[PDB]
Every structure is written in C-alpha cells, then in structure tokens.
From a paper:
The viral open reading frames are expressed as two overlapping large polyproteins which must be separated into functional subunits for replication and transcription activity. This proteolytic cleavage is primarily accomplished by the main protease (Mpro), also known as 3C-like protease 3CLpro or nsp5.
Of the 16 active site binders, six covalently bind as thioethers to Cys145, one compound binds covalently as a thiohemiacetal to Cys145, one is zinc-coordinated, and eight bind noncovalently.
Author numbering:
A (entry chain A), B (entry chain A): 1 to 306
Write the structure that this text describes.
Amino acid sequence: SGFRKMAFPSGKVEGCMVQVTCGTTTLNGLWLDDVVYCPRHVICTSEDMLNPNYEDLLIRKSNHNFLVQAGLVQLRVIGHSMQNCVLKLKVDTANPKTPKYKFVRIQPGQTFSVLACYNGSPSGVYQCAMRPNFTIKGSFLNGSCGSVGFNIDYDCVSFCYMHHMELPTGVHAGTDLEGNFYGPFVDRQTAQAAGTDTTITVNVLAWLYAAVINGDRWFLNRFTTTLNDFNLVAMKYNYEPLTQDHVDILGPLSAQTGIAVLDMCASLKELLQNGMNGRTILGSALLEDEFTPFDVVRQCSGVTFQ
Amino acid sequence: SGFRKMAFPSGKVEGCMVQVTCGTTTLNGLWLDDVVYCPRHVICTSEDMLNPNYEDLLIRKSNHNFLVQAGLVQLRVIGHSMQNCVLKLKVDTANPKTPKYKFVRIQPGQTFSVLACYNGSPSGVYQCAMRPNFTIKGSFLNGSCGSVGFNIDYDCVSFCYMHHMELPTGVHAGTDLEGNFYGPFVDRQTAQAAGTDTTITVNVLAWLYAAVINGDRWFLNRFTTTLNDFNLVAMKYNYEPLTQDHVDILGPLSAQTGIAVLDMCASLKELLQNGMNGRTILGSALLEDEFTPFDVVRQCSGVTFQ
Ligand SMILES: [Cl-]
Ligand SMILES: [Cl-]
C-alpha cells in the first residue's frame, strides 16, 4: 500500500557523470562509451551568454581546452564537435560503467527522473514531468547544467533530458541528448517567457485511479460524463483536452478497478468545480499531474529493473 | 532555483541489495561485508505471522535453508543468528561493493531515502520521514520487506531503517539495522494501531524558509510571536511543540534570509488559523513537514556526495 513520488534507481546514471571545465566555466557531462556529452555553453563566460555566437566562440577551443574529470581520474580528449546545443567530447577511454542506453525525445506529459549533479558529483534524485509548455519544474542551482533526466526499462536507460537554462520565472529548460531544446527556448540570456502551464489531464486521472487502489475513495460520485462535456470543464480550468487515445491508455487501470474512464472523468469534473473542501487525496491537497498511467501501473505492481 | 522532494543517490545502496528465500517466503536483504541482514519473518509462513515464536521456528532452520542470491550469483551461507527482529546471515564472500557505512537509529522528524526493492532488485527511490508516532508513509507492496532507508554524508551511508510490516491503516513500520522496531510495533499480524500523526513543526518552518529563498513570500506577515504563544496554536492543530533547540537549529536559515525564527512562527500561526485561501507554497496546497532544516540547507546550496 501507499503511493509516492518515486524516481528510478540512479546508480546506472551515477556511473556516467563527469565534470567538464572550459576556461573558468564548470558543469556536468554525460560519459557514454568514448563520448562525453555536455551543454555547449560550457565555452561561454557569463558575459557571452547575452549574445553568444557559438560557432565563433568554438573556433578558439581545442581538445586540450576541455578538461574532463571522472571523479578523480582525468580523461584525455581526442576530438570534439558541436551538435545543435550540445558538445560531444571524444575521449580515448570507453566508460567501463556504460549501461545499455538509448536517446529518446519525450512528449509533453511524460515523466522522468533527474539526477541533480554539481562538479560531476551526484547530489540527489527526484521525479519530473515535461510540462505542456515544454518547461520542467526542477531543482537546479548554478553548476547543475549537464544534469540529465532519464527513464529505465529493465536494464536499459533512456536518456531524454539535459539541463541547460533557468528562466527568470524560476522554471527550467533543456535539450534532449541530441542537443535540441524542448519547446522554443534557446541557450541565451534573453527575455524568454513560458506559455500557459496547463494541467496534464490524463496523468491526474491515472493518479485518481492510484488513489482508489489505495483506499482514498471519498471523491467517487454517482455521475458520468462524455469527452466533449468533460473537455468543456477542462478548458475552463486550463486542463489539457482529453482524447480517445488517453482513454485507451487508461483502460488497464479502468479494468483493474472497475471504474469506467468516463465515470472517473465525472469525479474529476466535480473536484474541479467544487474543490476538495479541505480534504486530501494520497496526502495531497491539490490534483497531482506528474504520474503517468504507466507510472501508476509500475508502482502499484512492484516492477523492478536489472 | 526550485525546491523538490529529493532522495539521495541510490547507487551505493543498490550494490548491497540481494534476494533472501527461506522455504516459500522471499524478501530482500542487505549485504554488507560478509553479512546479509534481513527481517526475521522470512522464516514465517503467512499462517505463522498470526502468533509466531521466532526462536522455536528458527530451530528448524540451517544455513543451507537460507538461499541468498546477489542478482544472478548464489552466495554461500556459513552462519546465521537472530538479533532482535533481524537475521544476520554470514556468507563466505565479502560484498566487493560495500561502501563506507554506519548503523544509526534516527529520531522522530528525521528524514531519509528509501530504496524500494522486490526480489533483491531496485524498483525506485523516494524520501520519507520518521513520523512522531514512529510510522512512515511509504510505498511498499508484498515482497518489499527488507528494503532499507538511509542517509549519505559525503562518502558514508548511514543505514537507519529496514521495512518489516504494513499496518491495517496503510502506514508502515520497521526496524533499525540492529533489529529494534521504531515505536511500539511488533512483527506479528496483530491489532496494531498508530497513535496521533502530529506534524513536525520544525520541518514546516524550514520548508517555509526554503520557500522564501525561492520567491514564494506571500505568506510573510507583519506579526511576531513567542514560543509559548505559538505552542498554544500548535497544540490545537496537533503540531509538535517547538523548543528552543528547534529555534537554534533554524538559526542558519534565519541568518541567510534575515527573518527571525519567531517572525516565521507568526506566519505559520496565521497559515494554521486562516488556511491558505486556495494559494500554494512551493507547488503544495498544504504545509510540508518532511524536509529537515539540514535538508533545506543541502538542497539550497548544492551539496554533493563522493
Ligand atoms: Cl512519475
Ligand atoms: Cl527531505
């Protein structure tokens, strides 16, 4: 019993974290096989970040200007290139702790675990979601750039995020491991504003299912609804529209609990219209939207990883 | 910026997790040096749990009845003993991944990270607190027994919890690594009820400090209070009494932000008396009490671990 915001075990990623220093800037890199991935703004000074020309700044950089430290051992850089907003530093030694891994670009509403690091050393692990506005609400201080987000399927790490920037509003933006930003953000100190942070409706429903599985059921009502009618309420509260694809994904949880997806939509409707009247659901006083339907199934069944 | 419920990196503990099977019961054990620690109810059947006599049930067990599997390799058991509510299984091979470690018994209100495991394999990591009633609000399914809670200071893992039981109310109870239960609970399927779950006042204040550090400041008011007057409000809302020791622990956060501890107590008072009027603090609609003052300092400064 019990349902918790739970990250993947981080050991497999911990073994990939290194420190990258260029000039006077130090951040984290990701060492997989004989390549080290890091944000390209490692080459920038604080003054460069206002209007950097990365191609021009890179011309002044040679292999030996990139200092790569794996804990206590120095790695030899034999090649470097820029791919979108990341640098790939080729080193002469394959990481002996490289796990099976893939690079994946996730969609808004998908969740992942972040290993926060400073100077190439792990600091902590927590769970995040890619928001509909393509930000994440993380915990990142100066020097955390290069920290990565990941998912694990049994024995394989799917890397999906690398941290790059913090918006003036306190939220965070980054790239996939090919160096492409999520959303419209750029690696410059510029007037960059996030759009509407809508709520991930399908994740809230999955979390309501998780609550029923664990004894929290006061919110179940006698009503049902339709997609179109529920979506009229969703729009009013800045909830993502619910699609038939979302309903299908919720099918397994609907099957286990015996509560049709649309009946649970009607319970969500009343929670949005009437509030929670000071009550709680799985220890929260608001509706949680950073659990996917796959997250709920995993935690409610005890799935493990190699 | 940003403040998140963050666990310690789990890699060092992942390397200590093994599977222990006795008869038809399988749970997790902790392999440190040449000893494997696991709950003593591994020797019990579901029928034994009603009224077990552990000394009598253990007489029928020999070294070869305890099957210990480290991932894929079988470990040879050369000795076993019972210490309070844990078994110590002596194996013929020291765990080569043993970190520096200590066994610590924590106090109510202290936090720690849990590595949930099934069949000796890590499933996920999340943060917990020892409640004032000596339970924890975890996420544990059948087979998770033997999962451990821990803290890390730089290079040293302090093991503080091993999971044993789930109360009928859905909360959880366990032992330190010497086999002594936290609180009055016992490893029997018995009418066991948790006492009042009071709120850890000092942790709520630390979390209010964390919020101010990150821009959430709407709750700061023009009032102050005294310990005795605040504690009259704390008692009414089932908050732990605040002591001068707690005030001293908050000193560093009071120094950094410039908000005297008692001024922040007056803000907490108004939040308890008037509620939050539908607002949020660090993304929560209730007052979080599972961050210690040391947790806040750590996350707000970027402390790392070897
Ligand atoms: Cl999640
Ligand atoms: Cl914490």
